Amino acid sequence: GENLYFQHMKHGRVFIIKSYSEDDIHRSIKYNIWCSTEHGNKRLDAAYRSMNGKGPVYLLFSVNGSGHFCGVAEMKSAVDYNTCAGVWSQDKWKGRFDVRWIFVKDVPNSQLRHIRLENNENKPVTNSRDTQEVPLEKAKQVLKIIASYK
Ligand SMILES: CNc1ncnc2[nH]cnc12
Ligand SMILES: [Cl-]
């Protein structure tokens, strides 16, 4: 058989999201919202707005030190930078944007550590920092691995 679904798109951008907090992951799944750092929010906002709805901005979530990704979400709005403070575990985040979680599933780093990022010094995708962008051809490979893991 074959899965040629992901191997076909050109308009799409994909970012790693790191979270120190398991509580924040749960709150994001529950309420379909997220917030990054200042520079992270700016990165995501720029990608969402220049995508202008002609493709998805995907977010690959991983809790720092957990050893695995925990799921996939799509950005669903621009960054609102002036919102209620202290809704996350730490009060160091300013703003909010909408997401839609697509997959909630733990995927061990062992399944993904062979994919390396030419834009991040050929480092494994599993050694990324928050809002590291993933080149589309590597992003396709990661997404197929996540969707097929069981
Ligand atoms: C709510 N946003 C976050 N929560 C915990 N850790 C992080 N690292 C980057 N963004 C976050
Ligand atoms: Cl704003």
PDB file of C-alpha atoms and ligand atoms in Angstrom:
ATOM      1  CA  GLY A   1       0.000   0.000   0.000  1.00  0.00           C
ATOM      2  CA  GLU A   2       0.899   3.664   0.211  1.00  0.00           C
ATOM      3  CA  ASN A   3       0.218   6.944   2.004  1.00  0.00           C
ATOM      4  CA  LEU A   4       0.907   9.784  -0.434  1.00  0.00           C
ATOM      5  CA  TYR A   5      -1.262  12.254   1.488  1.00  0.00           C
ATOM      6  CA  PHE A   6       1.436  14.345   3.128  1.00  0.00           C
ATOM      7  CA  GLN A   7       3.941  14.100   0.260  1.00  0.00           C
ATOM      8  CA  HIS A   8       1.865  16.463  -1.905  1.00  0.00           C
ATOM      9  CA  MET A   9       1.454  19.915  -0.279  1.00  0.00           C
ATOM     10  CA  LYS A  10       3.564  23.052  -0.749  1.00  0.00           C
ATOM     11  CA  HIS A  11       1.781  25.762   1.245  1.00  0.00           C
ATOM     12  CA  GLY A  12       2.267  24.782   4.878  1.00  0.00           C
ATOM     13  CA  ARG A  13       4.649  25.725   7.713  1.00  0.00           C
ATOM     14  CA  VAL A  14       5.482  23.642  10.764  1.00  0.00           C
ATOM     15  CA  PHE A  15       6.947  24.668  14.129  1.00  0.00           C
ATOM     16  CA  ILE A  16       8.210  22.804  17.196  1.00  0.00           C
ATOM     17  CA  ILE A  17       6.493  23.906  20.417  1.00  0.00           C
ATOM     18  CA  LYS A  18       8.275  23.098  23.685  1.00  0.00           C
ATOM     19  CA  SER A  19       6.495  23.325  27.043  1.00  0.00           C
ATOM     20  CA  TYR A  20       8.094  23.072  30.472  1.00  0.00           C
ATOM     21  CA  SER A  21       4.628  22.363  31.920  1.00  0.00           C
ATOM     22  CA  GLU A  22       2.352  19.363  31.533  1.00  0.00           C
ATOM     23  CA  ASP A  23      -0.422  21.535  32.999  1.00  0.00           C
ATOM     24  CA  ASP A  24      -0.075  23.963  30.084  1.00  0.00           C
ATOM     25  CA  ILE A  25      -0.417  21.111  27.580  1.00  0.00           C
ATOM     26  CA  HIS A  26      -3.628  19.991  29.303  1.00  0.00           C
ATOM     27  CA  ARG A  27      -5.007  23.543  29.367  1.00  0.00           C
ATOM     28  CA  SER A  28      -4.194  23.951  25.654  1.00  0.00           C
ATOM     29  CA  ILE A  29      -6.008  20.734  24.731  1.00  0.00           C
ATOM     30  CA  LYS A  30      -8.977  21.685  26.901  1.00  0.00           C
ATOM     31  CA  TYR A  31      -9.430  25.260  25.645  1.00  0.00           C
ATOM     32  CA  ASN A  32      -7.713  25.184  22.208  1.00  0.00           C
ATOM     33  CA  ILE A  33      -5.406  28.131  22.986  1.00  0.00           C
ATOM     34  CA  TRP A  34      -1.641  28.664  23.359  1.00  0.00           C
ATOM     35  CA  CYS A  35       0.920  31.375  24.077  1.00  0.00           C
ATOM     36  CA  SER A  36       4.658  31.357  23.367  1.00  0.00           C
ATOM     37  CA  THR A  37       7.497  33.689  24.353  1.00  0.00           C
ATOM     38  CA  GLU A  38       7.635  37.183  22.874  1.00  0.00           C
ATOM     39  CA  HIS A  39       9.979  36.222  20.042  1.00  0.00           C
ATOM     40  CA  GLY A  40       8.160  32.921  19.597  1.00  0.00           C
ATOM     41  CA  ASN A  41       4.777  34.615  19.325  1.00  0.00           C
ATOM     42  CA  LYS A  42       6.249  37.013  16.752  1.00  0.00           C
ATOM     43  CA  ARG A  43       7.612  34.107  14.687  1.00  0.00           C
ATOM     44  CA  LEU A  44       4.274  32.265  14.719  1.00  0.00           C
ATOM     45  CA  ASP A  45       2.251  35.422  14.065  1.00  0.00           C
ATOM     46  CA  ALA A  46       4.371  36.318  11.043  1.00  0.00           C
ATOM     47  CA  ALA A  47       3.955  32.807   9.615  1.00  0.00           C
ATOM     48  CA  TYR A  48       0.197  32.687  10.273  1.00  0.00           C
ATOM     49  CA  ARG A  49      -0.468  36.090   8.723  1.00  0.00           C
ATOM     50  CA  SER A  50       1.678  35.586   5.615  1.00  0.00           C
ATOM     51  CA  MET A  51       0.126  32.160   5.110  1.00  0.00           C
ATOM     52  CA  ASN A  52      -3.084  34.143   4.498  1.00  0.00           C
ATOM     53  CA  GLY A  53      -5.201  31.031   4.851  1.00  0.00           C
ATOM     54  CA  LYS A  54      -3.758  29.140   1.854  1.00  0.00           C
ATOM     55  CA  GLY A  55      -2.301  26.350   4.014  1.00  0.00           C
ATOM     56  CA  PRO A  56      -1.910  25.268   7.644  1.00  0.00           C
ATOM     57  CA  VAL A  57       0.553  26.342  10.317  1.00  0.00           C
ATOM     58  CA  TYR A  58       1.200  23.110  12.230  1.00  0.00           C
ATOM     59  CA  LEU A  59       2.533  22.944  15.794  1.00  0.00           C
ATOM     60  CA  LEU A  60       4.358  19.825  17.036  1.00  0.00           C
ATOM     61  CA  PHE A  61       4.174  19.808  20.848  1.00  0.00           C
ATOM     62  CA  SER A  62       6.775  18.307  23.187  1.00  0.00           C
ATOM     63  CA  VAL A  63       7.213  18.717  26.943  1.00  0.00           C
ATOM     64  CA  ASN A  64      10.807  19.640  27.835  1.00  0.00           C
ATOM     65  CA  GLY A  65      12.713  16.605  29.069  1.00  0.00           C
ATOM     66  CA  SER A  66       9.792  14.230  28.531  1.00  0.00           C
ATOM     67  CA  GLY A  67      11.493  12.170  25.785  1.00  0.00           C
ATOM     68  CA  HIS A  68       8.475  12.294  23.460  1.00  0.00           C
ATOM     69  CA  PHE A  69       6.174  14.492  21.456  1.00  0.00           C
ATOM     70  CA  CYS A  70       2.648  14.665  22.801  1.00  0.00           C
ATOM     71  CA  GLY A  71       0.668  15.808  19.777  1.00  0.00           C
ATOM     72  CA  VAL A  72      -0.107  18.125  16.890  1.00  0.00           C
ATOM     73  CA  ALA A  73      -2.167  21.297  16.691  1.00  0.00           C
ATOM     74  CA  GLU A  74      -2.925  23.844  14.013  1.00  0.00           C
ATOM     75  CA  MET A  75      -2.661  27.591  14.583  1.00  0.00           C
ATOM     76  CA  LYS A  76      -6.181  29.027  14.198  1.00  0.00           C
ATOM     77  CA  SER A  77      -5.808  32.789  14.770  1.00  0.00           C
ATOM     78  CA  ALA A  78      -3.271  35.580  14.904  1.00  0.00           C
ATOM     79  CA  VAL A  79      -1.599  36.469  18.212  1.00  0.00           C
ATOM     80  CA  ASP A  80      -3.639  38.695  20.519  1.00  0.00           C
ATOM     81  CA  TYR A  81      -0.882  40.317  22.586  1.00  0.00           C
ATOM     82  CA  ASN A  82      -3.067  42.006  25.227  1.00  0.00           C
ATOM     83  CA  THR A  83      -4.929  39.361  27.212  1.00  0.00           C
ATOM     84  CA  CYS A  84      -5.487  38.199  30.767  1.00  0.00           C
ATOM     85  CA  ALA A  85      -2.231  37.530  32.600  1.00  0.00           C
ATOM     86  CA  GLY A  86      -1.262  34.451  34.584  1.00  0.00           C
ATOM     87  CA  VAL A  87      -3.487  31.869  32.897  1.00  0.00           C
ATOM     88  CA  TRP A  88      -0.518  29.473  32.430  1.00  0.00           C
ATOM     89  CA  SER A  89       1.673  27.708  35.018  1.00  0.00           C
ATOM     90  CA  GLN A  90       4.232  30.529  34.990  1.00  0.00           C
ATOM     91  CA  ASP A  91       3.174  34.146  34.561  1.00  0.00           C
ATOM     92  CA  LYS A  92       5.886  34.895  31.946  1.00  0.00           C
ATOM     93  CA  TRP A  93       3.653  34.677  28.836  1.00  0.00           C
ATOM     94  CA  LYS A  94       1.977  37.705  27.242  1.00  0.00           C
ATOM     95  CA  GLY A  95      -0.868  37.073  24.807  1.00  0.00           C
ATOM     96  CA  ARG A  96      -2.988  34.272  23.384  1.00  0.00           C
ATOM     97  CA  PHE A  97      -3.803  32.607  20.083  1.00  0.00           C
ATOM     98  CA  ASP A  98      -6.282  29.952  19.030  1.00  0.00           C
ATOM     99  CA  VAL A  99      -5.156  26.447  18.129  1.00  0.00           C
ATOM    100  CA  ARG A 100      -6.982  23.285  17.115  1.00  0.00           C
ATOM    101  CA  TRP A 101      -5.452  20.096  18.454  1.00  0.00           C
ATOM    102  CA  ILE A 102      -5.362  17.397  15.742  1.00  0.00           C
ATOM    103  CA  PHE A 103      -3.532  14.498  17.401  1.00  0.00           C
ATOM    104  CA  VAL A 104      -3.034  13.896  21.106  1.00  0.00           C
ATOM    105  CA  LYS A 105      -0.628  10.955  21.178  1.00  0.00           C
ATOM    106  CA  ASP A 106       2.770  10.298  22.740  1.00  0.00           C
ATOM    107  CA  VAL A 107       5.441   9.607  20.137  1.00  0.00           C
ATOM    108  CA  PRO A 108       8.863   8.597  21.496  1.00  0.00           C
ATOM    109  CA  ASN A 109      11.824  10.672  20.376  1.00  0.00           C
ATOM    110  CA  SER A 110      13.355   7.397  19.164  1.00  0.00           C
ATOM    111  CA  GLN A 111      10.774   7.391  16.331  1.00  0.00           C
ATOM    112  CA  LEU A 112      11.879  10.865  15.167  1.00  0.00           C
ATOM    113  CA  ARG A 113      15.534  11.467  16.119  1.00  0.00           C
ATOM    114  CA  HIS A 114      16.821  10.391  12.690  1.00  0.00           C
ATOM    115  CA  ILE A 115      15.124  13.380  11.015  1.00  0.00           C
ATOM    116  CA  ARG A 116      17.575  16.285  11.046  1.00  0.00           C
ATOM    117  CA  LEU A 117      17.015  19.965  10.365  1.00  0.00           C
ATOM    118  CA  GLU A 118      19.279  21.505   7.732  1.00  0.00           C
ATOM    119  CA  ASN A 119      18.218  24.935   9.029  1.00  0.00           C
ATOM    120  CA  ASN A 120      19.283  24.031  12.596  1.00  0.00           C
ATOM    121  CA  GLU A 121      22.828  22.780  12.018  1.00  0.00           C
ATOM    122  CA  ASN A 122      21.684  19.259  10.967  1.00  0.00           C
ATOM    123  CA  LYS A 123      20.568  18.676  14.582  1.00  0.00           C
ATOM    124  CA  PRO A 124      17.849  16.064  15.234  1.00  0.00           C
ATOM    125  CA  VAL A 125      14.328  17.477  15.106  1.00  0.00           C
ATOM    126  CA  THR A 126      14.045  16.075  18.663  1.00  0.00           C
ATOM    127  CA  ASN A 127      16.785  18.462  19.853  1.00  0.00           C
ATOM    128  CA  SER A 128      14.861  21.610  18.855  1.00  0.00           C
ATOM    129  CA  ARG A 129      14.075  24.697  20.945  1.00  0.00           C
ATOM    130  CA  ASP A 130      10.628  26.314  21.215  1.00  0.00           C
ATOM    131  CA  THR A 131       9.282  27.652  17.847  1.00  0.00           C
ATOM    132  CA  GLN A 132      12.079  26.056  15.826  1.00  0.00           C
ATOM    133  CA  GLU A 133      10.735  26.000  12.279  1.00  0.00           C
ATOM    134  CA  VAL A 134      10.878  22.690  10.385  1.00  0.00           C
ATOM    135  CA  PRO A 135      11.555  22.638   6.618  1.00  0.00           C
ATOM    136  CA  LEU A 136       8.473  21.365   4.827  1.00  0.00           C
ATOM    137  CA  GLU A 137      10.121  18.227   3.421  1.00  0.00           C
ATOM    138  CA  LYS A 138      11.268  17.213   6.930  1.00  0.00           C
ATOM    139  CA  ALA A 139       7.885  18.244   8.393  1.00  0.00           C
ATOM    140  CA  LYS A 140       6.152  15.821   6.004  1.00  0.00           C
ATOM    141  CA  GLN A 141       8.357  12.987   7.263  1.00  0.00           C
ATOM    142  CA  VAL A 142       7.621  13.795  10.923  1.00  0.00           C
ATOM    143  CA  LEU A 143       3.870  14.061  10.345  1.00  0.00           C
ATOM    144  CA  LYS A 144       3.716  10.680   8.621  1.00  0.00           C
ATOM    145  CA  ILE A 145       5.647   9.084  11.471  1.00  0.00           C
ATOM    146  CA  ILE A 146       3.334  10.645  14.070  1.00  0.00           C
ATOM    147  CA  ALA A 147       0.179   9.623  12.231  1.00  0.00           C
ATOM    148  CA  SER A 148       1.421   6.044  11.766  1.00  0.00           C
ATOM    149  CA  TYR A 149       2.791   5.431  15.284  1.00  0.00           C
ATOM    150  CA  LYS A 150       0.777   2.987  17.406  1.00  0.00           C
TER     151      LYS A 150
HETATM  152  C1  LIG B   1       2.004  28.643  27.713  1.00  0.00           C
HETATM  153  N1  LIG B   1       3.273  28.568  26.996  1.00  0.00           N
HETATM  154  C2  LIG B   1       4.392  27.820  27.529  1.00  0.00           C
HETATM  155  N2  LIG B   1       4.289  27.156  28.677  1.00  0.00           N
HETATM  156  C3  LIG B   1       5.327  26.474  29.191  1.00  0.00           C
HETATM  157  N3  LIG B   1       6.520  26.454  28.599  1.00  0.00           N
HETATM  158  C4  LIG B   1       6.695  27.112  27.408  1.00  0.00           C
HETATM  159  N4  LIG B   1       7.759  27.246  26.567  1.00  0.00           N
HETATM  160  C5  LIG B   1       7.394  28.033  25.533  1.00  0.00           C
HETATM  161  N5  LIG B   1       6.107  28.371  25.680  1.00  0.00           N
HETATM  162  C6  LIG B   1       5.649  27.810  26.838  1.00  0.00           C
HETATM  163 CL    CL B   2      -2.668  42.351  19.722  1.00  0.00          CL
END
